[PDB]
């Protein structure tokens with residue numbers, strides 16, 4: 171993997187502007203890629219693109235393979251007469267996931283019935299071909315989703331045992347009885363991957379690479395966990411005996427208790443790591459670079475007992491990261507992965523990362539709270555193989571962060587910036603000052619959240635880790651991301667050898 175010296179922008183597709191309550195894979199997405207090209211940007215970073223449940227988090231999806239039906243543009247379907255679209259009164263500047271849930275699912279189902287009614291034979295055959303091609307995960311996903319309508323939205327591990335345990339007759343009967351519902355979920359996937367593939371081709375024509383993302387741990391209530399319970403630490407009822415998270419941090423005094431099921435890595439190794447090969451394969455269909463959230467988990471993971479309500483109780487357990495990445499390398503060739511190596515990082519995590527040539531990350535919001543700080547540009551690797559951010563989707567906006575920063579952080583930030591020739595007068599200028607610092611550094615890639623380009627405060631924060639609600643909702647307003655913003659990004663990239 172050869173990283174050129176460049177910049178990019180972090181913008182989850184949901185945050186795009188446009189009608190009907192959520193950003194989608196259509197014209198406004200194309201406009202953003204055009205904006206990015208004219209700004210001199212060469213990378214677009216997104217978060218995981220799978221279907222979300224309660225909390226609306228990309229990082230806890232009903233499937234490790236499925237695409238988010240909320241990202242489906244309905245306008246192309248309306249043009250073909252499959253559905254009539256009416257705005258129910260979506261807000262400006264944010265996703266109302268409650269109203270989106272209430273309006274978009276019925277609109278998708280209406281489009282599916284219209285499709286079965288009016289679709290040309292060519293479209294039906296394309297849809298059927300897609301299904302055959304993706305059956306190895308799609309049959310499980312569509313039935314998993316279909317079965318939730320038969321059982322009050324219960325998670326798979328609360329379903330009647332014959333279904334929970336995937337008995338052959340139970341499954342066969344269910345697939346038959348829920349044939350239409352199964353087909354509708356398949357249809358949402360066909361549309362997602364067609365629309366994404368189109369958008370990927372557009373990015374490629376404009377010289378833009380898409381950085382994707384995948385959590386190390388998958389979600390408890392997901393189709394693949396249901397299909398392969400032996401791969402996870404579950405009890406006889408299919409419930410996790412232990413769960414994922416991070417220990418009592420400097421940050422969180424009780425930690426983060428993520429709740430995800432943990433892998434039986436011994437079982438995965440004996441099985442040949444097929445889940446990981448497939449995940450990476452699928453990610454590489456959608457993205458040019460893929461980041462793995464919590465990369466340190468491949469070396470060792472914090473195992474929290476299920477009966478513990480926080481992340482305080484537990485232990486570190488070693489994982490065969492070396493074994494997995496040797497296998498990936500001998501089977502894919504060259505690891506096109508980015509390591510999310512934030513948090514408590516040991517020498518063993520770093521050596522695993524460096525052994526496989528994986529670029530790590532740097533976050534400038536973390537750089538000013540103590541000159542040996544690793545997030546300060548002068549401490550970055552000489553080889554430059556790192557991605558620098560002002561903040562990620564888990565951080566506040568940089569203006570928001572600055573407003574609550576400690577006096578010592580603020581003073582050291584100003585001085586350190588001054589050492590790099592960078593000055594500012596107004597606090598609203600801090601996001602651009604830090605973006606400038608990142609671009610001046612040796613990091614091959616500088617990727618910035620669009621909220622920092624706009625210098626927005628804490629209201630535009632994408633995620634606040636720990637809080638279960640109010641997240642993943644920020645959206646651009648139409649025209650907010652202006653030609654002048656693009657020209658300023660372009661000047662900065664030109665001034666720092668990134669164009």
Ligand SMILES: *[C@@H]1O[C@H](CO)[C@@H](O[C@H]2O[C@H](C)[C@@H](N[C@H]3C=C(CO)[C@@H](O)[C@H](O)[C@H]3O)[C@H](O)[C@H]2O)[C@H](O)[C@H]1O
Nearest residue numbers: 227229230426427428429463564633634635636637
């Ligand atoms: C890396 O992965 C993180 C873990 O998934 C992700 O975190 C966000 O998404 C989580 C799903 C969300 N909720 C979980 C966290 C808890 C406590 O920390 C539990 O109480 C919930 O039941 C879980 O669902 C996180 O709050 C949220 O930060 C990061 O965004 C990603 O970078």
Ligand SMILES: OC[C@@H]1C[C@H](O)[C@@H](O)[C@@H](O)O1
Nearest residue numbers: 416463464512513564635
């Ligand atoms: O959830 C945000 C971060 C993600 C990261 O992988 C982990 O190390 C911890 O610090 O929390």
